[PDB]
Amino acid sequence: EIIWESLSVDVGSQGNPGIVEYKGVDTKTGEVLFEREPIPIGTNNMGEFLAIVHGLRYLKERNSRKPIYSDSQTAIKWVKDKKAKSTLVRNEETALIWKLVDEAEEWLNTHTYETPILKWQTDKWGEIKANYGR
RNA sequence: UCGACA
DNA sequence: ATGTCG
Ligand SMILES: [Cl-]
Ligand SMILES: [Mn+2]
Ligand SMILES: [Mn+2]
Ligand SMILES: [Mn+2]
Ligand SMILES: [Mn+2]
């Protein structure tokens, strides 16, 4: 029941909190459609969140109605709520990740989209195509 | 007390 | 090990 005609996104990190990045790939081919420059400090969930929002913006800009796959239950909820409930401390070092997160929320609250955000069923389909981790 | 998704 | 939700 995999919808191959879709966009798959996923976070990648070195430590958690740690260096965070993310990418979006064509679920069907695996071709990398976009990738975020590594952010010094952030959490896994913030990254998973930014990945979905970037995916929403990527698809809207190209007038695509394809759904987005994410393996993050947390990020999917945050996007649904248009509010990332991260409890990562807000300080000088986490300023960048928080700026991106707040700006992502800002975009969600000022734009519209019908993009279905679907849960990638890892336990049945294996690793999401945009995966970085082992 | 966990269970789940990362 | 941590980040989060049910
Ligand atoms: Cl971003
Ligand atoms: Mn993931
Ligand atoms: Mn990268
Ligand atoms: Mn905010
Ligand atoms: Mn992954």
Side-chain angles (χ1 to χ4, degrees), chain A residues 10-11 71 131-132:
Chain A
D10 195 36
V11 70
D71 61 20
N131 182 51
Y132 291 81

PDB file of all heavy atoms in Angstrom, chain A residues 10-11 71 131-132, chain B residues 6, ligand 5:
ATOM      1  N   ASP A  10      13.355  12.936   5.857  1.00  0.00           N
ATOM      2  CA  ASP A  10      13.874  12.362   7.087  1.00  0.00           C
ATOM      3  C   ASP A  10      15.026  13.195   7.627  1.00  0.00           C
ATOM      4  O   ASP A  10      15.733  13.865   6.873  1.00  0.00           O
ATOM      5  CB  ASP A  10      14.327  10.914   6.846  1.00  0.00           C
ATOM      6  CG  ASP A  10      14.546  10.146   8.135  1.00  0.00           C
ATOM      7  OD1 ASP A  10      13.785  10.377   9.103  1.00  0.00           O
ATOM      8  OD2 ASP A  10      15.468   9.301   8.179  1.00  0.00           O
ATOM      9  N   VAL A  11      15.196  13.164   8.943  1.00  0.00           N
ATOM     10  CA  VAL A  11      16.265  13.907   9.590  1.00  0.00           C
ATOM     11  C   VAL A  11      17.504  13.024   9.671  1.00  0.00           C
ATOM     12  O   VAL A  11      17.425  11.808   9.513  1.00  0.00           O
ATOM     13  CB  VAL A  11      15.872  14.305  11.031  1.00  0.00           C
ATOM     14  CG1 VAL A  11      15.822  13.062  11.916  1.00  0.00           C
ATOM     15  CG2 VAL A  11      16.866  15.327  11.590  1.00  0.00           C
ATOM     16  N   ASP A  71       8.721   9.307   9.052  1.00  0.00           N
ATOM     17  CA  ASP A  71       8.616   8.219  10.019  1.00  0.00           C
ATOM     18  C   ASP A  71       8.501   8.767  11.433  1.00  0.00           C
ATOM     19  O   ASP A  71       8.506   8.007  12.397  1.00  0.00           O
ATOM     20  CB  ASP A  71       9.822   7.268   9.930  1.00  0.00           C
ATOM     21  CG  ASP A  71      11.155   7.954  10.221  1.00  0.00           C
ATOM     22  OD1 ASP A  71      11.167   9.032  10.849  1.00  0.00           O
ATOM     23  OD2 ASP A  71      12.201   7.395   9.829  1.00  0.00           O
ATOM     24  N   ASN A 131      16.362   8.124   4.671  1.00  0.00           N
ATOM     25  CA  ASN A 131      17.135   7.803   5.865  1.00  0.00           C
ATOM     26  C   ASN A 131      18.644   8.047   5.795  1.00  0.00           C
ATOM     27  O   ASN A 131      19.262   7.935   4.735  1.00  0.00           O
ATOM     28  CB  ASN A 131      16.873   6.344   6.254  1.00  0.00           C
ATOM     29  CG  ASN A 131      17.593   5.937   7.521  1.00  0.00           C
ATOM     30  OD1 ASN A 131      17.497   6.610   8.544  1.00  0.00           O
ATOM     31  ND2 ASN A 131      18.312   4.821   7.462  1.00  0.00           N
ATOM     32  N   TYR A 132      19.221   8.393   6.944  1.00  0.00           N
ATOM     33  CA  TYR A 132      20.659   8.616   7.071  1.00  0.00           C
ATOM     34  C   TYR A 132      21.207   7.542   8.009  1.00  0.00           C
ATOM     35  O   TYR A 132      22.236   6.926   7.744  1.00  0.00           O
ATOM     36  CB  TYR A 132      20.981   9.961   7.730  1.00  0.00           C
ATOM     37  CG  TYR A 132      20.683  11.217   6.945  1.00  0.00           C
ATOM     38  CD1 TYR A 132      19.395  11.745   6.893  1.00  0.00           C
ATOM     39  CD2 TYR A 132      21.715  11.931   6.334  1.00  0.00           C
ATOM     40  CE1 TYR A 132      19.145  12.966   6.264  1.00  0.00           C
ATOM     41  CE2 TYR A 132      21.475  13.145   5.700  1.00  0.00           C
ATOM     42  CZ  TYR A 132      20.190  13.659   5.674  1.00  0.00           C
ATOM     43  OH  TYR A 132      19.959  14.878   5.085  1.00  0.00           O
TER      44      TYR A 132
ATOM     45  P     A B   6       9.348   4.717  13.203  1.00  0.00           P
ATOM     46  OP1   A B   6       9.056   4.624  11.749  1.00  0.00           O
ATOM     47  OP2   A B   6      10.086   3.614  13.874  1.00  0.00           O
ATOM     48  O5'   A B   6      10.058   6.111  13.488  1.00  0.00           O
ATOM     49  C5'   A B   6      11.465   6.254  13.544  1.00  0.00           C
ATOM     50  C4'   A B   6      11.795   7.634  14.061  1.00  0.00           C
ATOM     51  O4'   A B   6      11.282   7.766  15.415  1.00  0.00           O
ATOM     52  C3'   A B   6      13.270   7.968  14.177  1.00  0.00           C
ATOM     53  O3'   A B   6      13.765   8.417  12.911  1.00  0.00           O
ATOM     54  C2'   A B   6      13.269   9.041  15.256  1.00  0.00           C
ATOM     55  O2'   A B   6      12.838  10.292  14.756  1.00  0.00           O
ATOM     56  C1'   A B   6      12.201   8.497  16.207  1.00  0.00           C
ATOM     57  N9    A B   6      12.720   7.593  17.233  1.00  0.00           N
ATOM     58  C8    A B   6      12.452   6.254  17.376  1.00  0.00           C
ATOM     59  N7    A B   6      13.030   5.706  18.418  1.00  0.00           N
ATOM     60  C5    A B   6      13.731   6.753  18.996  1.00  0.00           C
ATOM     61  C6    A B   6      14.543   6.829  20.140  1.00  0.00           C
ATOM     62  N6    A B   6      14.782   5.790  20.946  1.00  0.00           N
ATOM     63  N1    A B   6      15.103   8.023  20.436  1.00  0.00           N
ATOM     64  C2    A B   6      14.855   9.062  19.631  1.00  0.00           C
ATOM     65  N3    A B   6      14.105   9.118  18.533  1.00  0.00           N
ATOM     66  C4    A B   6      13.563   7.918  18.268  1.00  0.00           C
TER      67        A B   6
HETATM   68 MN    MN D   5      16.307   7.981   9.697  1.00  0.00          MN
END
